[PDB]
Design a protein around this nucleic acid. Sequence first.
DNA 1: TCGAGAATCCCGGTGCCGAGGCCGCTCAATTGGTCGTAGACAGCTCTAGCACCGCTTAAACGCACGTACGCGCTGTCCCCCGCGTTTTAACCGCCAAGGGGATTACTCCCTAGTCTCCAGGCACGTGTCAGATATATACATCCGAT
DNA 2: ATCGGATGTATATATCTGACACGTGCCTGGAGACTAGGGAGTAATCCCCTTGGCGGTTAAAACGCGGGGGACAGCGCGTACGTGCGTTTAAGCGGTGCTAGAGCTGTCTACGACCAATTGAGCGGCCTCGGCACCGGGATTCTCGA
Lengths: 82, 106, 366, 97, 95, 96, 95
Amino acid sequence: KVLRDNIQGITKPAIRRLARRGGVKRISGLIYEETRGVLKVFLENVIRDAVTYTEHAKRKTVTAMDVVYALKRQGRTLYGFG
Amino acid sequence: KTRSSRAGLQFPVGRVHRLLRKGNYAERVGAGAPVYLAAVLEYLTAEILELAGNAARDNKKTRIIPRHLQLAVRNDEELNKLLGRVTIAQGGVLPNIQSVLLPKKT
Amino acid sequence: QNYPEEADGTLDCISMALTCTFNRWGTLLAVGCNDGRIVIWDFLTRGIAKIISAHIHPVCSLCWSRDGHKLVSASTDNIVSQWDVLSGDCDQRFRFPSPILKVQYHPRDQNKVLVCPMKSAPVMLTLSDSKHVVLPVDDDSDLNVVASFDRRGEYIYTGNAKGKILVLKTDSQDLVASFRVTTGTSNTTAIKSIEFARKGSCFLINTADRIIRVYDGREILTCGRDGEPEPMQKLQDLVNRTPWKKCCFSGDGEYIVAGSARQHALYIWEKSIGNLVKILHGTRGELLLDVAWHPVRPIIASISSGVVSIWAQNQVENWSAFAPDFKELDENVEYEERESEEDEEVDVTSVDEELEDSKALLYLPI
Amino acid sequence: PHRYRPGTVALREIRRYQKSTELLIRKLPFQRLVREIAQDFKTDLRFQSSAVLALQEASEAYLVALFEDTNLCAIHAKRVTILPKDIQLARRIRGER
Amino acid sequence: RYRPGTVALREIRRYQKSTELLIRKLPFQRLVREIAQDFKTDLRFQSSAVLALQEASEAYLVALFEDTNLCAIHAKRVTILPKDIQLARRIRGER
Amino acid sequence: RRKTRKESYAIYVYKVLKQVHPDTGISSKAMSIMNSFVNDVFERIAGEASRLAHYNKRSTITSREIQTAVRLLLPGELAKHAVSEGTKAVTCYTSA
Amino acid sequence: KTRKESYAIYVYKVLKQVHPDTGISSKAMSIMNSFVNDVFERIAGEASRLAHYNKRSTITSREIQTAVRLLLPGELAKHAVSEGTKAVTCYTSAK
DNA sequence: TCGAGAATCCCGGTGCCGAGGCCGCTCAATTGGTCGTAGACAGCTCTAGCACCGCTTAAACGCACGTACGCGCTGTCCCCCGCGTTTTAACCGCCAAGGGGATTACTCCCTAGTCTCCAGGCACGTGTCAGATATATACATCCGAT
DNA sequence: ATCGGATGTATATATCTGACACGTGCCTGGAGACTAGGGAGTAATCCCCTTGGCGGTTAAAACGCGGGGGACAGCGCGTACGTGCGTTTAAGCGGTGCTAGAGCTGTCTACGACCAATTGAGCGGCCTCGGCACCGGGATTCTCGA
C-alpha cells in the first residue's frame, strides 16, 4: 500500500536525540521536513538495490548479507553481518 | 562467415567474446553475453555521438573538437549522474556565473 | 494505425475482475467475478450493463452467443447454463462430467457451443434439444484436450497432451486429418493450447517445450492424414525463459502478441518479420489473466489480479479542426494567395472484416 | 524543575548521549516504514528481523554524519542556530546534488 | 578601464569561453622534475606524461575554487578567503 | 624498429557516426577519448557482472546477469532503453 | 547442520598471544571476520589487477609487495612489508 | 534620458598541414564436430516470520513563557584592484647525440594437475560467572542570594 | 566576586542469569609424491626519442600608485525556541499456533571448452586536397559621465 502516514513515524524527539548525538543545541523548527526528505531519498537507493538483488536470486525475502552487499556497492560499508 | 550481421549491430562481437574470455572475468560464459554487450555499447555510443554531432553543427564546424563532447556530456543530467567523477582532456568547463554576483544600475 | 503507444489507467467498476473478452469490435466486457456472479461492463463507453446471480461457486471463463442472446460461462462448479443477456435469468441448464476450459460460439452455428472438457473428448451441446455430441478423437481419451473453431467455424481443431493435433468438421465430425508435432531433438512435447485469429486462418500453438509456435489452418487438410511439422517462426524469449499462459491474435491480422505470467513482459511481433518492435513496461506484482486486442483498432488491454491495465492510443483532435477553410499552423513562407478569384422535388429518406457475433440487445440507460 | 536557561540541560544531554551506545529511532515504526516503502518496487515481500535491524543503523550512521557536517558549516555562518539552507549546502558540497 | 568589477566579468566570461591550459610549460615541468627527484633520482619523463598530470591538476583545483565560491556566498560576502578553502577541504571528506 | 599492430575501437564508432550524421568529421583526439570511454564502460560492466556471478555461487556468466548489472549500474529511463535494445538485439540474433 | 567457513579460532589465538586475560563476545568475532575478509578481497583484487597490467599470467610475492606499498599508508606499510619479508625468508630457508 | 570612446563580430582573402581514402599484406574468427559436465527439475524437511492478543508504562503531545540571539541597520576604514609603467625568460625554432625501450630467440624450471591418506575444525552438549539490575550515598554544578 | 541550596553524577553493595568458554566426533580438505609442458628470463640489438643546448623576442610578468568599494565592529529588537509540566498513547515485552517458504539431495540433458584451417576483416604506408588557421579591415554593440 501507499499511505501518507508512517512518514511522520520519526516523531520530533527521535530527531532531537539524533541531533544531540551529533552535538548541536539550537535547531530551528523547520528542519524536520527536510530531514525526512533526505532520509527518504537516501533510503530509496539502498532499498531499490536490495530488492533488485533479492529478485535476481529468485527468492522473495531479503536477508542482511545482501543488504550489506548493496551498501558496499554504493560505498558505505557495514561490519558485523558477514 | 561473419557474426556481427547476425543481429544487425555494428560493434564487433567476436572481439568482445575473445577479450572477455581472456579477461578472466569468469571461467565459462554463455552465448548471449557478447552480443548483449555489443548492443549496449552500441546504444551508449550512439547516445553520446548524436549530441556530439548536434554540438558540432551548433558552431557550424564539421570536425568535432573535444569541447563539443564536454558540453554535450555536461549539459545533460543523466550523463552527469553517470559520468560523475570523470574529467576530459582539453575539455574545458561550461559557462556559469553565480546569480547574486551580477551588478546592475539604472 | 501502428501499435499502441500511449498508456491508459484502470477500468474497475467493481473491485474484482477475472476474465475479459471483446464481442466483435469491443462493445461490452464480460467480467466473471470471483463470487459466483456475472458482471457486464461497457467498453468504449466506460460503464456497466447487467449483473447476473448465476450460482454460488465462482466462474472462470466467459463468451457470448452468435446471436448475442446468451452468456455462456465455463463454470468451476460444472454449471453449464445458458444465462440470458436480456432478462439475466437462466434459459438452458445442463451439467457436464468434466469442467470446461474454452467456451466459444460458432459465428455460423450458435446451436453447437464450444466445450473443452478435461480427460475426455470435446462435446458439442445443442441448444435446440439439449443433446450432447462427443467429438471423435484419436489415440487416448483422457488427455488435456482443447477444442477450437477456425475463422468461420467450419472446421474444428483439437489439441491433445502427447503431441497429436486433430482436424475434423464442426457438424459432420469426419475426423480425416491428424498432425504430429516435432519431437525436439530427443524428447517429445505435448500441447498446452492453440489460439486463432479473424483473418488469414493462422493460429498460434503453445506447447510444453517453452516455445510458442505458429501454424496455418490450411496445411493439414492439404497434406492429408499426417505430415511433417513446419512452423513459420519459432518465437520464444531467450533472456528470461518466461512461461506462456494466455496469448491472442492481432486486431488487424498482421501482428502477434504474447503474454507473460509474472514478469510484466508483453511481447509483440509481426507475421512478415519476426523481429521485436516494442515491449510493454508493466509494474511487477500481479498475474496476467486475459489478453485480447480491439478486433479493429490497435490497442492492448490486459486483465490481471482483479484489475485491468490498458496501453492505448489516447487521441484528441487538433485545434486546427475548426473548419476546412480555417487552419492554425505555423509557417515562415510568404502567403500563397488564391489564383482563381438546383430545383427538384425529392424528399430525403437515406440514413478486420465483419462476422456474426452481434445483437447483444443489452443496454439500460436507467 | 525551575525554568532553566536555554541550552543548559542540553550540554548534559550531549554528555550523556555522545558516550552512549544504543538505538535512537524506535523499532516498530521503522520496520513498518520500510515495509510500506518496499511496496512500490515490488509487492508481497518478506523481511528478516536481522536484515531490517542492520538497515536502520546504517541509515542512522549516514544521518548522524550529516549533522556533524552541518554543525561545522553552521559555525562558519557566525550563528549557533541550524538552518535549512545549511543542510542543502552540506548535501550539495558532499557530492550528491 | 575604470569602474572596478566591470572588467572582472568581461575577463571571466572571455576565459570561460576559452578552453586552453593555464600554466607555463617549463616551470611546471621543472617542478614535477623536482618533486620526482625527491622520490627517486634520474627519472626520464615522457613529454606526453607530464602534460597528463598538468591537466588533472587544473581539474581538481578548479573544482575546489568553485566550492569555496559558494561557501563565500553562504557567508554574505563576495570575496573568498583562506578559511573557506579549509572549509571546503574538510567538508569534502578528503582531509 | 619493429612495427607493431594495435587494436582500438576506431573503425566501429566512426561507422556509427557516419550512420547517424554522414556530414560531420571527427578528430583523432575525439577518437582516442571515445576509445577510452568504451573501454571504461566495458570493463566496469563486465567486472561488476563477474563479481555478482561469483556472489551467487554460479560458475557461469549468463545473459540475465548482465541485464541485472545494467539495471543496477544504469540510472533512469536510460536503463529501460538500453535493456530493451539489448533484448531486441539478442532476439534478432538467435534465430539466425 | 552443514559445513560453513569462518575465522574464529585463529583470531582467538592471536588475541590470547598478546592479551591472555581479556575475553570477547560474538559481535567482536563477526566484526573481526568482516574486517579480515574485506582487507583480503581489497588487497587480492589489487594484486590481480596489477598482474593483468603488465600482461603477465602469474601472481608472485613481489606483486603483493607492490600492492601493499601502493595501498596501505606509509608506516604501517613499512611494518607489514618488513614482517612479511621476514616470514617468507624464514619459510623458504626451512622448507 | 543622451553622447564619445571603447570594445567585439563579421566579411572577405589567403595560405597550409591534418583527416581521409586507396593498395597491399597479413592472422585470428568461424564451422563443424567432439566430450564432458553444471545446473535444472521434483521431491521432502524444518523452522520462523507472521497473525494474534494482554498488559504495562516510557515516552510523545501540547500548552506556557521568558529570554538569546538572527537579523536589519548603521558607521567605519582599509586594502584589492585596475591602470599604468619597466622588465625579462617562456616560447619558438633550430641543432646533435646515446641509450634504452621495445623486439627476437631461446633453454630451463615453476607449476597445474593427478593421485594419496590422515588429521583438525565446526556441529553439539554442558558447566559456570561478568556484568546488568536495584539501593544509599558523597560530590560537582546551575541557579539564586548577597 | 562569593557563598548556600536543589539536583543530576559516578560510586559501593547483594544476586542471578543467560551467554562465554570448554570437551567430544569424524569427514573433507590439505599436505606428501610425481610428472610434463608451457611461461619466462636472459643474451643481443638498433633505431626513437629525450635530454641537452643555442639565437631572437615578445608576450607575459613584475612593480608602483589612487581610490572606492566592500570587509568588519556594534546596537536595538522582537521573536522564535528551550525549558517545564500534566496527560494520553502506542511501543515493548510476554507468549501462542503454522503455513509458507527456504534449503538440501538424486537426477540426467542441453550447453560450453578443444581444436584445425581457412581467408576476409582489418591494420599499416602515401599523397592529397580542403577544413581550418592567419590576417587585414569595416560593421556592430556596450558602457558610464556630462
